[PDB]
Write a protein that binds this ligand. Structure first.
Ligand SMILES: [Mg+2]
Ligand SMILES: [Mg+2]
Ligand SMILES: [Mg+2]
Ligand SMILES: [Mg+2]
Ligand SMILES: [Mg+2]
Ligand SMILES: [Mg+2]
Ligand SMILES: [Mg+2]
Ligand SMILES: [Mg+2]
Ligand SMILES: [Mg+2]
Ligand SMILES: [Mg+2]
Ligand SMILES: [Mg+2]
Ligand SMILES: [Mg+2]
Ligand SMILES: [Mg+2]
Ligand SMILES: [Mg+2]
Ligand SMILES: [Mg+2]
Ligand SMILES: [Mg+2]
Ligand SMILES: [Mg+2]
Ligand SMILES: [Mg+2]
Ligand SMILES: [Mg+2]
Ligand SMILES: [Mg+2]
Ligand SMILES: [Mg+2]
Ligand SMILES: [Mg+2]
Ligand SMILES: [Mg+2]
Ligand SMILES: [Mg+2]
Ligand SMILES: [Mg+2]
Ligand SMILES: [Mg+2]
Ligand SMILES: [Mg+2]
Ligand SMILES: [Mg+2]
Ligand SMILES: [Mg+2]
Ligand SMILES: [Mg+2]
Ligand SMILES: [Mg+2]
Ligand SMILES: [Mg+2]
Ligand SMILES: [Mg+2]
Ligand SMILES: [Mg+2]
Ligand SMILES: [Mg+2]
Ligand SMILES: [Mg+2]
Ligand SMILES: [Mg+2]
Ligand SMILES: [Mg+2]
Ligand SMILES: [Mg+2]
Ligand SMILES: [Mg+2]
Ligand SMILES: [Mg+2]
Ligand SMILES: [Mg+2]
Lengths: 394, 63, 131
RNA sequence: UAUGACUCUCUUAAGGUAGCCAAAUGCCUCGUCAUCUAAUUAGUGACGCGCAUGAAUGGAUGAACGAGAUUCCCACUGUCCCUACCUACUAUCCAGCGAAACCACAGCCAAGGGAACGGGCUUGGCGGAAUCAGCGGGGAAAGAAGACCCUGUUGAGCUUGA
RNA sequence: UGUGGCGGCCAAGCGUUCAUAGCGACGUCGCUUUUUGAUCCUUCGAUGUCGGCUCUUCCUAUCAUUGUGAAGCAGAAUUCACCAAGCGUUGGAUUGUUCACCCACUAAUAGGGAACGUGAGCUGGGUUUAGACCGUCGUGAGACAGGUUAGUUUUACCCUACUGAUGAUGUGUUGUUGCCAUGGUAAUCCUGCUCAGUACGAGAGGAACCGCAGGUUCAGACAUUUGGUGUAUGUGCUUGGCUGAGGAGCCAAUGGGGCGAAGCUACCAUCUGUGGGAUUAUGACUGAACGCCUCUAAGUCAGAAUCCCGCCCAGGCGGAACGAUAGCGCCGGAGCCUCGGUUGGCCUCGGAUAGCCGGUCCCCCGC
RNA sequence: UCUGGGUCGGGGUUUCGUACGUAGCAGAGCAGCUGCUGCGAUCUAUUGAAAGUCAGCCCUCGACACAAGGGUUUGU
């Protein structure tokens, strides 16, 4: 017979293979559509999740109750050191799809990027690209390289560039860099290639890729939770207390005459470590990294136009389970996917953004830097010392 | 923006922290954390609790 | 113009709140919440400013054994405002109000939440304290 | 208006008296009224026309008592909204030791036909070693020569006007 | 398919007039197996026999929502009908209930199937053993789809299916960065402001499009804040006992109780959730058939919660580019095994069919 | 890459709430001496003290030794 009362389905069948992700780095499944009218730019970047904090900001939206009132909003900090471009890959459009055509790497490749090509850097003789790097210093290799770039100009329609992260500017344990193809979007293929050719062996910061108050997408792997039951995995109803064969179960997994178990039935398995793409996160702030000038360092990242302080984005005691953020960072509104110290892919939006929420202008009034390692109650150590006074240890 | 002072301890309450307690006879209080909140709702004197600002001001500690 | 932001609702069906006015009613048993579409095995529940249907359990006998409309003015459950402030009250309190929005009684004993006062002007007129 | 003390008639050994009741007993029935609720096929109090109540086949009542049956209220709580977290022993893996149930052959489906619900047949969809932890849709899964129903010119326990 | 349910044809009449806006007698034709029958084909060396809870999918005979046609459609509200199953269809009192009835919310509280879905998923309220009580029947043992009460719910470690987890084929070995063939697929609805007390209407009343602010249901996350947990057994407090006492500690199956880091976690906190194409219903254009007319016959336009693709999820006994390649690679006579099939090659216009093909350029434009 | 992690120590953060001892003409009082000396829960100062703090917190460039290794396979 029919179901007695109607109820919506638990879970989504659109994220259906809830398995462990085959990749650790988030992957751009679709880049933004290229048009020749726009100038030549990058469409993606790669950051590392540090932590979250507060913003007190001034809201400009006409018609709301919260118009010209201060709000408190959660933000996520992703540390984004500048990336190094080490090669260009071309693509051709085939009736079977989009076949890669030719890859040309740079002459000098750092040990960060060379670590990626090995499972054991300690036992390796570090021989990667050693016979390849003798192609940039002889005439018979340079002519071949120019013919390879000319063939890519003649035959390629999609140009992607190879860039890797800089792991020695991070407080992480890993030294092995992350490589990624970024689709170069701009004018013709010829000037698109003659842009990446000069940016070979060069550093691209996050300011060349993203602007202030841009609505971007975050691609990354969910934090893993292991083999979970159906009550945690699919959020089904808990069976009552009198249930004999366990209560954290789905009671009926199917009818009789469809004598299989359906693929839409909620069943136990791996929860977490799923590759997700969350769209429409606003960039509240592109911070500036630590830099030494005239002997002393400029670390006042979390200072706003209203705060006028000398504090960094790092809270008291540092970010919990991450480290210290000493490079450029991107402040995204709300939470992003994944755990801390996780590599995330920041992608430009696939959509045209014609909305007052998407086009709202953000000014920061206050960034909270109290300790996240407990209930912190002091913004800075100088404020803490000025409130507490002298202790016994002095 | 206006920062508050804790009704039990006396510490500065930054805008994202703490809670507010509005009693039936008015008298809205604000609390830094659940420790000071439970100390207020258990009817305890801040002048007898060592880490509060009022105890330091009464016993003339610091300076 | 401006519309109500959602809050931490914590007063389901069956909740007995107290009646903070001079109608002679003492309690208000919440039998349902207006504006609730529903969900399978999910009780209708309300926060401050939500119109509910209530029933007087003790008080004057001419208010008992019938359904009244009411507006919740105070809740004990902590709710977050957009200013990042978590607020809660000492008790759960409501007043008896007709279907249009005018109050049945005259005066209010105790404060009235800002989320209720900004939506109901005839309760904010008789309110002694705000938030 | 109705009900109807009263009368007449038919009748059997009398024709149910005092009580009591939609009861553990009332088919109709979720009877009617009142109360309890916002809402009650439940509960309680009345009404008695009682299919089929009733006086040691005992009637009515009733303090104390009850691991007896039922209704409501206070207080209390994860019973629930709506789930979450922690601990111990398992389950997991390893060293050693190590069974049993079950088993025509075996095991991916849709439809057709067919002993009228196929794993095998027909037509299609298709199919790729060996495995691990779970799981309860299917094997019309296992246990037990159906206790229900019928037959047997098969029985037993019990009763009586056989 | 009698009965139940649903749908037609004819049209006497109802509808102030008026058969057919909406209905429809007397007749008559059908559909369905969500009703009960009728039958006895399968099952009695056993297919677990009612509900409820839980969970997934399907149907349309569409309650609401999208797009529309018709009214006895002025507006508002409401009826009839089409494409249409994408998304929803609730919280409760009573009863074991299915059903029913009432309260309240809502946008609507539509109907059903899957062995009358679902007992090695639960429960055991009912039914349906043995104990008892009442009423009726029987001389009696006992009987009662008549009430009442108490009454053991076993096994998966096998195969498949499903959920996840290793790996396998073969590209000489391995590594990096990628493509997507195929499967899955998701967002949905409502309120307030303005429009506007405006159109419309004698009046009472009373819209809609574009915008703005939010919310419901769902989905995916996440822990800065609030809450929960807490054996960091972290730090105080405390009962009984014990180490002669202080100090420091221990035991009481976590002794008990405050506060509590990290981690995990809650619409109990927070963030995010999208674009095209062909088109359906329908309304049309041009225009015959049929000198007129006609959305249709040829041709053409607009067109949507549907469909398909995008976005997103997985990544083929499926490819690609590139790096490094240890006794191995690249180039220039002998034979030995094994697997086999074959017995000259066509090195190319685009295409039309009620039309083609090749020259010629003395013409006119250009690449 | 005279460098790398690890351990220890230190600093930062944070949790609880003011450690032991000493001193006090603080202490309801009581007792023994003729004001003193003892018993005394608790209080005050030292003392936001003491204790814990990555095992999955953050910086150290402070001490200590270790890390230039072992085994099994793979060919166009
Ligand atoms: Mg349904
Ligand atoms: Mg049980
Ligand atoms: Mg924290
Ligand atoms: Mg329910
Ligand atoms: Mg009598
Ligand atoms: Mg009841
Ligand atoms: Mg009675
Ligand atoms: Mg009798
Ligand atoms: Mg009797
Ligand atoms: Mg073993
Ligand atoms: Mg078989
Ligand atoms: Mg065969
Ligand atoms: Mg099974
Ligand atoms: Mg069986
Ligand atoms: Mg037999
Ligand atoms: Mg015979
Ligand atoms: Mg016999
Ligand atoms: Mg015998
Ligand atoms: Mg005889
Ligand atoms: Mg019929
Ligand atoms: Mg007529
Ligand atoms: Mg026959
Ligand atoms: Mg059988
Ligand atoms: Mg079976
Ligand atoms: Mg239809
Ligand atoms: Mg069944
Ligand atoms: Mg079953
Ligand atoms: Mg069972
Ligand atoms: Mg029973
Ligand atoms: Mg019995
Ligand atoms: Mg096992
Ligand atoms: Mg597809
Ligand atoms: Mg007018
Ligand atoms: Mg927290
Ligand atoms: Mg807590
Ligand atoms: Mg916590
Ligand atoms: Mg001691
Ligand atoms: Mg013991
Ligand atoms: Mg606690
Ligand atoms: Mg047409
Ligand atoms: Mg068109
Ligand atoms: Mg279109």
């Amino acid at each position: 017979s029919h179901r007695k009362f109607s109820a919506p389905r638990h879970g989504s069948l659109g994220f259906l293979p809830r398995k462990r992700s085959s990749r650790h780095r988030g992957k751009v499944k679709s880049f933004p559509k290229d048009d020749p009218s726009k100038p030549v730019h990058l469409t993606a970047f790669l950051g590392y999740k540090a932590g979250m904090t507060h913003i007190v900001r001034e809201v400009d939206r006409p018609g709301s109750k919260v118009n010209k009132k201060e709000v408190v909003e959660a933000v996520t900090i992703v540390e984004t050191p500048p990336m190094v471009v080490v090669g260009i890959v071309g693509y051709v459009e085939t009736p079977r799809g989009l076949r890669t055509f030719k890859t040309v790497f740079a002459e000098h490749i750092s040990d960060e990027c060379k670590r990626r090509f090995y499972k054991n850097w300690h036992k390796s003789k570090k021989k990667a690209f050693t016979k390849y790097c003798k192609k940039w210093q002889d005439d018979a290799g340079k002519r071949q390289l120019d013919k390879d770039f000319s063939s890519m100009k003649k035959y390629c329609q999609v140009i992607r560039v190879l860039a890797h992260t800089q792991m020695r500017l991070l407080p992480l344990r890993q030294k092995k860099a992350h490589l990624m193809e970024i689709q170069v979007n701009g004018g013709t293929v010829a000037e698109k290639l003659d842009w990446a050719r000069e940016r070979l062996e060069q550093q691209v910061p996050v300011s060349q890729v993203f602007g202030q108050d841009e609505m971007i997408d975050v691609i990354g792997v969910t934090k893993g939770k292991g083999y979970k039951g159906v009550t945690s995995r699919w959020h089904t109803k808990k069976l009552p207390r009198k249930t004999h064969r366990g209560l954290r179960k789905v009671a009926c997994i199917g009818a009789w005459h469809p004598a299989r178990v359906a693929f839409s039935v909620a069943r136990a398995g791996q929860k977490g470590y799923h590759h997700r793409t969350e769209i429409n996160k606003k960039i509240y702030k592109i911070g500036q990294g630590y830099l030494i000038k005239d002997g002393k360092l400029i670390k006042n990242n979390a200072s706003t136009d209203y705060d006028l302080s000398d504090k960094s984005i790092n809270p008291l005691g540092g970010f919990v389970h991450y480290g210290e953020v000493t490079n450029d960072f991107v402040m995204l509104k709300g939470c992003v996917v994944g755990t801390k110290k996780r590599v995330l892919t920041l992608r430009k939006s696939l959509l045209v953004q014609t909305k007052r929420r998407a086009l709202e202008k953000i000014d920061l009034k206050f960034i909270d830097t109290t300790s996240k390692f407990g209930h912190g109650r002091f913004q800075t150590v100088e404020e803490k010392k000025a409130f507490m006074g002298p202790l016994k240890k002095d | 923006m206006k920062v508050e002072l804790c009704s039990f301890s006396g510490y500065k309450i930054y805008p994202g922290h703490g809670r507010r307690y509005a009693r039936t006879d008015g008298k809205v209080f604000q609390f830094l954390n659940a420790k000071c909140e439970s100390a207020f709702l258990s009817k305890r004197n801040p002048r007898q609790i060592n880490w509060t600002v009022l105890y330091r001001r009464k016993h003339k500690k610091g300076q | 113009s401006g519309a109500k932001f959602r809050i931490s609702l914590g007063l389901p069906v069956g909740a007995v709140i107290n009646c903070a006015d001079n109608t002679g009613a003492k309690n208000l048993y919440i039998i349902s919440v207006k504006g609730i579409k529903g969900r399978l095995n999910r009780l209708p529940a309300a926060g401050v400013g939500d119109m509910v249907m209530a029933t007087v359990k003790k008080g004057k006998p001419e208010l008992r054994k019938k359904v009244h409309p009411a507006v919740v003015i105070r809740q004990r459950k902590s709710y977050r405002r957009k200013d990042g402030v978590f607020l809660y009250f000492e008790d759960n309190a409501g007043v008896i109000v007709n279907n249009k929005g005018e109050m049945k009684g005259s005066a209010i004993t105790g404060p009235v939440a800002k989320e209720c006062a900004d939506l109901w002007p005839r309760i904010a007129s008789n309110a002694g304290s705000i938030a």
